[model samples]
Target: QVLEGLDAVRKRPGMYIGSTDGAGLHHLVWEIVDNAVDEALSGFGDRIDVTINKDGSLTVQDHGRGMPTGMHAMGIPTVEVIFTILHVGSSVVNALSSWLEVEITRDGAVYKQRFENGGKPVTTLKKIGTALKSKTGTKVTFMPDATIFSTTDFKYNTISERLNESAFLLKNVTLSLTDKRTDEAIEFHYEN
Candidate 1:
């Protein structure tokens, strides 16, 4: 499983997403965010950042088991599947108004990758560069297509409530979010 594996995602995204409408679009974010929160749930990290950016985009940052930047397990890199396989595009048509930029820091080393066209690995772009020193974490910057979704706008209170609910679901993780566009932010951590 480490040396070789098969492409595991459903070829037709609709199979998982149901539909590529507003609901589906937001579902994508939930999937990605949940994956990040899952790390904290697994006792791997502490705080996670979910920021809605000014460029009509957002990023999820989590300090956890940073994935290996180099190495192939099958037809692709051996990085975490849940980490890379997201709503990003392998085709511009699929992205329409969405793309993802990723950075992984671990063992005092860092690397970057931008996923586009529905999450296909973009060639040597996977290993953009190595940093001298950095903490261990995962930073994912995601932007949705304004044209695809009915609205690209997100609300602070709405997202906060959802994340707060998730904090309860996880039962033992700290989650934070910042609306860079508006400067509204919230942190959730319910210790039982």
Candidate 2:
């Protein structure tokens, strides 16, 4: 399934989602976050935390089963392949990506990626360490490149509204967002 979408994304990346502009950049983050939420729904994870850094970057973390680190039938660490290859992620676009990693743990681990300019990744994949007392989850920190976004700044109210909507839909799940751009630190969290 991912291969087919990759063919399409390679042929016409814009058609699959939209233009590679600011909206597309934001869409990428949401797509990945939604995947984490799905893991929580499956009882593999319980929390999702997002942070907007002072340097105009964003981070998202989830406490679920980590991606599998086993070898595939073709003799490759499936998780490594997912990060190195384009259009090969565990989202609905491809089932192979999910199948490869889901075998490791149903209660997922923390995965982190950094992106710049809408959807362009600028950092390598980093697995969260279990030694840390923090909850087992995924963290994503991205800075919307000025080259891609009309504005590098984020709106607090807009983020608040979206976080609120997610809380309403997720019921018992906790959602939190923190904005540190202004002199006053603004934070939002919801738990049922």
Candidate 3:
């Protein structure tokens, strides 16, 4: 059942993961990190680490029960399908996109049909890791497509404001953003 859904998603990236534009580029990080948050919600994980490298790469890691490493019915590793396919996440996709008001969730994973924008979809969703350990977690690292964004650089203050707002809204969850673009690094972390 899950494999079938994922296979369908892999066949269509634009519907579930949104566009290849700037918003969609940044959204990739949010989508991966949100999975960790779902684990936290299910009492399986804690602590999410997000790093923005000076070279414009972003990494998000979580300390929780990592994704499953077993083979799907299709004889493909779930991890490979997630990192290389589209809309192959767990059933948690429903909760995450609920706030966005986009009807993209199905059976806990995201649907591949919701990623369209301006009548087109871009980029398939893919899983990156699969390990069944005590502390299951997920870590996603991606480089923004230069062709999608006019500028690959992100503003420090702008990111700070967004983090501050998230920290304020999420109660115990801490939000941090670091800017390594300058000779002196700037870091921001907040908890309430």
Candidate 4:
């Protein structure tokens, strides 16, 4: 049987993320970035942008095949499935977030959804407009629940260290990190 909502994760985040300390808070970033990295592994993405927003949220944008925006057999949008289902990537992050938002650029338009209070969809996937008719990607912004994490602050050195390692290992991929709170930015790229 499947868990109905994200209550289980919120009740016990450690089971999913190991701990609610700084380590676990940082783990959420990696979980989302993993999806973007997988896109590169599949040969669909080559650029990834990670930002620590001034408002204390984190955003990961990947230039890949955007998430599925169509309806699922489960009677909700496929992107919703990804954020609500425990077995899928990003769901855990959604479950543990105070608020989360996803913007998908595909099908010649941008579609968006927002979830709050741990995985409850506050807004359905809506077609916001059409301007990026030639662009395709996924951007996710989330705020780690202050109630769940020991510290919500993300260290630039910690994220950059890991991203630097990823850039060094992967050829033809560009990874960028920006800290909006401090106006700091850096990019890493390696060519074979």
The CA lDDT of each predicted structure is: 0.64, 0.50, 0.45, 0.91
User: Who wins the lDDT comparison?
Assistant: 4
Q: lDDT of model 4 at residue 31?
A: 93
Cα deviation in Å at residue 87, candidate 2? 5.0
Q: What is candidate 2's lDDT per residue for 85-175, written digit by digit as tens? A: 5543332222111111121222334444433222333444444433444335444344443443345555656666666676677767777
Per-candidate TM equals: 0.75, 0.62, 0.56, 0.96
The parts of candidate 3 lying over 4 Å away from their true place are 1-21, 87-135, 183-192
Residues 156-183 of candidate 1: C-alpha lDDT, one tens digit per residue: 6777887888888887688888988888
After superposing candidate 2 on the true structure, give the runs of residues whose Cα lies further than 4 Å from its correct spot.
Answer: 1-13, 73-76, 86-135, 183-192
How well is each residue in 77-111 modelled by candidate 4, as lDDT tens digits? 99998898875548899999999999999879999
**Candidate 3: Cα lDDT at 47:** 55
* Model 1 TM-score relative to the real fold: 0.75
lDDT of 3 by residue, 1-192 (tens): 333333344334356657545554455556655676666556654455666768766555655555654465577544444443433443222212211112122223332212222212143233333333243445554454354444456555555565555445544555556555653333334454
* Residue 118 lDDT (model 2): 27
